[model samples]
Target: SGSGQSTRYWDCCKPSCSWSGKAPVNRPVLACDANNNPLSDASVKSGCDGGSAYTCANNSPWAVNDQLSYGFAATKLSGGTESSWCCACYALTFTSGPVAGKTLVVQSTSTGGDLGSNHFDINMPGGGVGLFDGCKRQFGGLPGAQYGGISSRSQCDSFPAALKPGCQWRFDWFQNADNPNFTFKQVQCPSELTSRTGCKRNDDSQFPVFTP
Candidate 1:
């Protein structure tokens, strides 16, 4: 149940901002690190390929002060899938949407009460759209399927499903607009933090592609 100011909202790289796409010419992705500073490009593995498949995840505790992380399957270099590994901090400052003035907080958490893993806890003002209601799933539905693979942070502002820069879920994805990792209905003030439900879990669903 840790928290921070919403003003910390910022963009991060797949591995570490210190070694993100900025140095694409030198080396693309790097290995895992703790302090956010990744190892030298010389230690980079040929299998460390991001292929630009991620954006700002809305539900996972993957973002910590703009330092997002992705786990590489043992043989992912040649061809394997990626997954959210863990997290440290949460997002701040509502990036977009009608609740623009609201603040956001991402924390180390899971989607369905799965503790052992890390996740992000989002905090905002006013009742968020169906997306943050805990009732909405990550993919499948109209909005989710339509814009699942969106890369723009502004997409977080659109309806839970309808996002900008369409994309799809590559695997199981979940969140807790009410709490971290959908642990349970958030225990915050029910009056201020309203939640909604009634949709099927959009686990491992498909999403539209954005070629532009």
Candidate 2:
């Protein structure tokens, strides 16, 4: 069995001399990348659309030292597993409640557990409300919804019944967070964000390699 506890947090996007919104905290609405590309359609069902849904802070550069002010998550792994998943993408679907049927894509930026486990610590844009634990379902609640799981980006014709309509809704209208081709590797801190540390699978790992 894996750890079952998940905590919600947020971070800030503005630069400062005092280090606020730094490292492991952060919130949100629309699904957009760093470039503000709409991750979904504007005409989809409620909780899934809206061009201005996302905030500027959601585009913050993902990093270990920044306190998670962005829309990324910490996984349950260590060493190589931790390093490999850094910056990798995952697609999440809220299985129940007010946000149910909404799907979003997030990247892995930290580890939220002891060692190996199938648990996921999700990132809720805008810090979430109340319990910060809504619409989060276990791994198998949906087909192929696992850590590093992959799905078709073009259509939902192959998804399970409950998710099929959602998939089709995403396909016929907006972009799906499905990343069929991602590699576990080291990523450099962008030149602009030099205060951030580059990700490494091991002490001796190269900066640009896929993995050590």
Candidate 3:
């Protein structure tokens, strides 16, 4: 339903949507313990704030096949609020980069990137811990630029085996394009996404909406 600029990041902090009262969802986005294990308590504080909660490794992006991928994003759409975005899904077709014809289906798992109009900061491990750096606490000091993330494929070797696939995905399927633009529209939350985040919007009967 809209077009937008794009960016990349994986702060490794607990997603902003993981907190309670962000939306009227069945549950909040899954916040993890420092170990990346999902915690049942929605009241858990984010590791970004020196608390125990951090983003789950499962929240990272992965290719489904070749032209398609599934992931989560910190979204900031024009004319939208946190409640309207949290747990919602969007099908974003890239308009630029090697990923240009490809599509990335992302669920809104966080907000408040201070990103300008219609922005989706796609989450991929090693995609730079832009503002907050829970990755240092989680992964024990990642290397390279804080705004753009690690350089070269070999740098992924520094990542844990569990997170390497998502890191390497940047160079492989993603081609490490720089903040490529995309066209986006709200869509139904895919189970593949909900199964990991444990959140589904109460307003899903309307797959495309955001007002107030």
Candidate 4:
């Protein structure tokens, strides 16, 4: 268990875990080609780095209910680097703002240069494209604030059809909370997340599923 400060981003870049050796997973997280179709090769260079790999648009977060959400985050925990965190599920309990008391169970799909220890930068469409503009390469361009992302649910309509749900999720269930804080504990990955990411932590080891 640990404490963390939460932020958000959706640069549309290939997730770091999409490459091999990030964790003891069955394989790396799934990456996509420029067309957003799954790429079986884990060695492809990221679009942000001028290669063919880009983020899969549908890897965005979603709601299971008002109190629960499932998503991916670029995580940096206090005692572990990406190797210990990648592909492992964690249940983050909101400790601040409108999202207080809610539970966000997330898989660490990537890590960020701007993040500090115990950071969990969630990946929501339109939630800013920090440090890269892979979105420009993927969808042409996304309209909204680059730091905080789109302003309202209507702006979600501007997102490509594959990403609309996650963008809209920000306004609806997320309530646009401004970088809320959370307490987290590692847990087992759910199939909903693993099926999309196409990787599973080899050390999941039967940790219990999380509840708020």
Candidate 5:
């Protein structure tokens, strides 16, 4: 979204991309996975079914509380380098959607294959799979269908408590664009942020600022 000039983008969480092989497949990885272990054959064959915490196993980015506790993130092919950014936090703002203006904090743990270099594959439970559609825009265009597909976890009963959507987002990274993978520092989530949303302020939170 920062004039990064990406040629293409897609929602990696969709079954056609994440779990199933339609275009190209880029799997998500855990901070603990070093040898680049892929999802089991059975999991991929079964579509990596379900969205519950229990079903998160197999290919769903390791169901750790750090990710599932909130609306975490899944990266592009770069996610295999989890050692550098596994627990890193990112602030994602939707430019269009019912949940637009709201800013949500997400941790990076997995990879998304079909996304552009500047795209994020957001968790569905935090909102809905439509975020994939919203994020696919040119960072400044009407929200319309570009890459249409079925999501593995496409249902969203509600937003994350008090958060809604409608604000433009700018990536503020502490590490600078030169180190695009994400460099973060753990800190206390500010009171302004905590009081306004479902996030809790604690050392467990990582606050990153864009230095570029």
Candidate 6:
């Protein structure tokens, strides 16, 4: 995500606020979005039906074979640059219910450009299998590649004898769908992650979060 851009944060858009007009809403802490981004319709998701739903509870920064989630504030519907609602500025809150006490900080949202290395994978409970672009091969993989949502599960079993059995990872997947309007299904459990989550110092800070 360090590709570097010369633009300002969240563009020249004024700091507009939200009022929950005609729909349920909440106040969100403002953060830096892609400066001078050219996408439209930024979206947010914690779980389904506008709630938090991730279910993995391991203290590890990364969760393999587990469920993860992303969300956005409703106030960002005005940015006409993002063609899809899945822009990089959205904020996801792990709202009420499953894995209720845990949360993931959106260091940055990926634009999912026309890249190939980025792919998709899924994980199931206890010991489940994750399907990557239809193939259950890339269970544990690297980041920055164009892939779709992280699927997780609560238990791992005798495996399908075809997919990655040890697929336990952490924040390591990004949505690469052409249609942002489409909704990602509720990820199953502690399954696939979009990237490694133990960096401590996310891009949001100059150093590790717990680094004294």
Candidate closest to the true structure, highest lDDT? 4
Tell me the tens digit of each residue's lDDT in model 3 across 1-212. 78887888887788888888889899999988877789989888788888789888898788878988888898887888999999999999999877898888989999846655699998888888977888778758567699999879899997877678889888888999898988888988888899999999998778754220
TM-score of each model, paired residue for residue: 0.19, 0.29, 0.94, 0.95, 0.33, 0.23
Q: Cα lDDT of model 2 overall?
A: 0.31
Any residue pairs clashing in model 3, and if so which?
Answer: none
Task: Output candidate 6 Cα RMSD.
Answer: 17.7
Instruction: Name the best candidate (by TM-score).
Output: 4
What lDDT, from 0 to 1, does candidate 6 have?
0.22
| Cα lDDT of model 2 by residue, 1-212, tens digit | 11222333222111111122223222112233333344333232222121122222332323223112123455554343543454444444443333344433444544454422344454322222122111122111222233322245433344333334333332232233222121122233232222121221223223432111
Instruction: Answer with 3 or 4, whichever has the higher TM-score.
Output: 4
lDDT of each: 0.23, 0.31, 0.85, 0.86, 0.29, 0.22
| Model with the higher TM-score, candidate 2 or 4 | 4
Error of 5 at 203 (Å): 12
Question: Higher lDDT: candidate 3 or 4?
Answer: 4
Clashing pairs in 4: none
TM-score of candidate 6 against the unseen true structure: 0.23
lDDT, model 4? 0.86
Residue 55 of model 2 has an lDDT of: 20
TM-score computed on alpha carbons, candidate 2:
0.29
Over 1-212, each residue of candidate 5 has an lDDT whose tens digit, in order, gives 22111111222232222222222113322211112233333133211222211112122211222212133445543333433333344554433433333344454434444544444554332222234432222122222234322221221113222111210011111100111232222333333223222223232334544221
* Candidates, ranked, lDDT: 4, 3, 2, 5, 1, 6
Candidate 2: list runs displaced more than 4 Å: 1-6, 11-56, 59-70, 77-80, 114-117, 124-212
Q: Report the C-alpha displacement of residue 75, candidate 6, in angstroms.
A: 14
